[PDB]
């Protein structure tokens, strides 16, 4: 029972505020919890909390980034994929502004943005990071503050299992081998990383040794680690709480098809808390099933 | 060459208007050319020519589709990827409204220096939306077939059109079906999958490859979404390597769709020809990309790389 | 009596039966909206889609130029905020034939206390505020016949009956509901019935008040204001709206240039969103008793 | 032939910057003239020159005001009345944020905001100041920096006649008697103040003594001075380069009808038609003269 990535994000911003005087935080939420958050109390002069439309909040972030601030804009994936999309694309990505978008994803059907990562991935300059747990969130937030350019960080509201130690360092374009195995590689991000580890345990019990790779860095992706995993194991399963189109599965297939073609079987949302994970097919057992399918495709 | 796909579209709408009384056409352009287009003159009571913002034009199309009309909204890829994106996604795709978007895409030619005003990732943005089907005609004849089919199918459709004349590839009586592509040439060494302007260039490339002893199958895949999975898998089993070619970003378009399919069904090399740097590779001048585009020779180079990846 | 919002819904059905060019737009996706009388009677002329309110106004604008007469159901808070620019720039300056039916909720921002003032200052916009069900029906029918932008302010709660079912509405014409020689009370919306209550209370103290309903805020009935001024020598205005830029301001503008007399304004003085209907009226000072007090002040100002 | 109020504004910001470290200036204009303006050169770290949409510029001003800055947002009246209106009303006025909007007003028909003052006047908490000349602009800008709350200052690009001395002090809610007269009072603001003085001269030549009042403080308006002028002269003419509805004439009528009813005859824009201009719109000294003659006949 580790804390939510959204909660880890809030704590990481307080540390960043202490260490980096250029960091500013923007939030359009006017609730009491927001106004009395740790960042709000510790750095009131760098906390921009106003009742303004989400697309306008992104526009403010854009402006502040051009005058020497490093804005972290707290928002929701549904806004990023909808009403704020145009400003993100036209004002932030093409001009390459230094805005960090911290988008909470709630895990109609529209109000669930199942393709947020896909939309951000296709924009120029945008980097897309999906922390697995509290410790990785902190590492991603600190790194995002130091890199130049637009960043999308996907967060969650519910507690998620601990996967990494507190002193992990994050680097864009670098993933992590969490477990070794020669028969298949499972590449996962977000909540699916812990489930990939669970799946690898279940697979061991049936005589299948799975390498498990965390790929929080969805864009830019770790091409060399994917190619090395492909050469060693000969088959990949990707797992993401996201549409199977345009996310991790697509990014991995795009890389391997041009470098070292092997089976890539995608676990994700196919169509449009636990009962919904189960209906969409985002359990450890779903990953197991995908691995069995990946093994049959080896040639 | 043949006429522009944008021009074929306008003519096809006139025929549709004659055959199908539910078809309505929306266009925000108030120029003389628009007001006196053939559809405008033939069916003025079904031509909604309204000087409103492009997102509002799409909102009218959305509304008209819910009251029994079949709206064809003529717009630009720049609007679809920008100011109209939210209404397309939230009002048309998620609710699955019966709107056909005919989006003219500008050539590979930066505007003033607004690279954004190019919309080089239009197909990718439409592809990832639920329910949206994405069709990219190669020439006049295929445009007509796509427009007529789009009118009959239920649900949101994005049709990408072009302003410049493009070579004839298909015969006038071609039939289009979503999910079905076409083998234009047979060959056992590699398959070239292309759409839009790249289809004719893939045929040119196949000729150049023959002269070097490489026999290329060429497939037209105007139906980007849903894609022809069976034809891709058959091509993969027969030839063992694919090159994709699209006048579009290499991320999220045809190359990505093909790689997604083959990696889960029959993994083989998929080498992608498309726009790599959306600002222009800061090496070669603008005049070069403007004169050439992506070329048959680029497809040739991609094929040679694909052959080395066979295992 | 029923809510003006409810009378509006019924009137649209009648309009639909008589006028084939009428279309209704509504962004509300609730079951009540999808099964409203107009939705059921004229589904082919009902545009119900989840789109932003400013886009709904933009759609109404477009539809008005292709032969439809669009009635755009919205809220006063949207008209005064997110939809304001499209209303001003796309509908008013170009003079498009759009009818805005804005339900006014009776935070601070989420209460548009200046909706009428913002609409009044726009060119070409006419502004009508029905007192009750019968006047709503009359205003909706007239709005469909006039050419040009109209703002009709509606409410969600039941309001007392004031007019008979055969009332005719004409823009630019108000109505003397009660005669009196000492003062004139000019009111609109919910304040019309309260003006009648106030006039009864005033009669019991020997003050005879003329009561005028001015649902037609813009264009205002200048002639009736001037005649009331000449006959009674003092006016009280009453509106559920800011004292700046609404009925009181419109009346003062007219009388100061034609027949200057006291105009004492009853309305919202300061924002302070106070979350009961009655407690709200009392805190803002919109009761019959407040109108009585205003009349007493108006009498002392006669010169 | 003094300088433009927009130019006086630029100069006043430099002084404010020297005296007040919390002042920040926002401008979306990316031209060379803006980037090398005096404020830009003197205080580059407090000049936020960002090519963003005008409504986003206002959003930045809003945010900066809540973190201890005193932002002056340079914009145009057409943006305040259009694309930036919603942020001004919903983000700045209702929450009562400390933002000063310096709106240049150009002197379709939409792109001329003839009702900018009316739109700002009706919003809660917004104060509205319309300087007549360079000296009053400086005074208004300096005062705006000290008061708490949203302010709208209307500026112009063209040179305007000098009306006030360089050391004038401005106070919200206070107007100024510029000339005494017992027969009528002319209340004016902006460019109309100089013309009211011209009209008063013309009226003197016909035996009519007009008091002239400058009312740069449109909101809050100087109620006491209006009532005193009404008691002393018995008739008012208002003059504004603005729609006759919802501006100065309406503000004066609102006050006098509830305190001391007298004729208020309004000179202003009657009819919108983006179009010799002063003459067609009816904003000349002679128009003010004609209004005075009408006001005299209305005395009872």
Residue numbers in the entry:
A (entry chain BBB): 2 to 108, 115 to 279, 286 to 312
B (entry chain DDD): 2 to 312
C (entry chain AAA): 3 to 108, 115 to 283, 285 to 312
D (entry chain CCC): 2 to 108, 115 to 282, 288 to 312
Sentences from the paper on this structure:
Transketolase (TK, EC 2.2.1.1) is a thiamine diphosphate-dependant (TPP) enzyme which plays an important role in the pentose phosphate pathway. It catalyses the rearrangement of sugar molecules by the transfer of a C2 unit from D-xylulose-5-phosphate to erythrose-4-phosphate, resulting in the formation of fructose-6-phosphate and glyceraldehyde-3-phosphate which are fed back into the glycolysis pathway. Here, we report the biochemical and structural characterization of the ‘split-gene’ TK from this organism (ChTK-F) which has been reconstituted by combining the two proteins encoded on the C. hydroxydothermus genome. This is the first example of a ‘split-gene’ TK that has been reconstituted and found to be active.
The apparent molecular mass of the native enzyme after gel filtration chromatography indicated that ChTK-N eluted as a dimer (∼62 kDa) whereas ChTK-C was purified as a tetramer (∼132 kDa). Initial attempts to crystallize the reconstituted active fraction of ChTK-F resulted in crystals of a tetrameric ChTK-C. It appeared that 200 mM ammonium sulfate present in the crystallization conditions had disrupted the formation of the ChTK-F heterotetramer. The ChTK-C dimer formation buries 1700 Å2 per monomer (13% of its solvent accessible area), which suggests a dimer is a likely oligomeric form of ChTK-C in solution. The ChTK-C dimer has exposed surface hydrophobic patches on the interface with TPP and ChTK-N. Formation of the ChTK-C homotetramer observed in two crystal forms buries these hydrophobic patches, however only around 5% of each ChTK-C surface accessible area is buried. Such a tetramer is observed in the two crystal forms and in size exclusion chromatography, however it is unlikely to be stable at the lower concentrations of the protein in solution. Initial activity measurements of the gene products ChTK-N and ChTK-C and reconstituted enzyme, ChTK-F were carried out using a colorimetric tetrazolium red assay that showed that the individual ChTK-N and ChTK-C did not possess TK activity but the reconstituted ChTK-F was active. The individual ‘split-gene’ products of this novel TK enzyme have been shown to have no activity in either a tetrazolium red based colorimetric assay or the more accurate HPLC assay. This is not unexpected since the crystal structure of ChTK-F shows that the PP and Pyr domains lie on separate parts of the gene and both are required to bind the cofactor TPP which is essential for the reaction to take place.
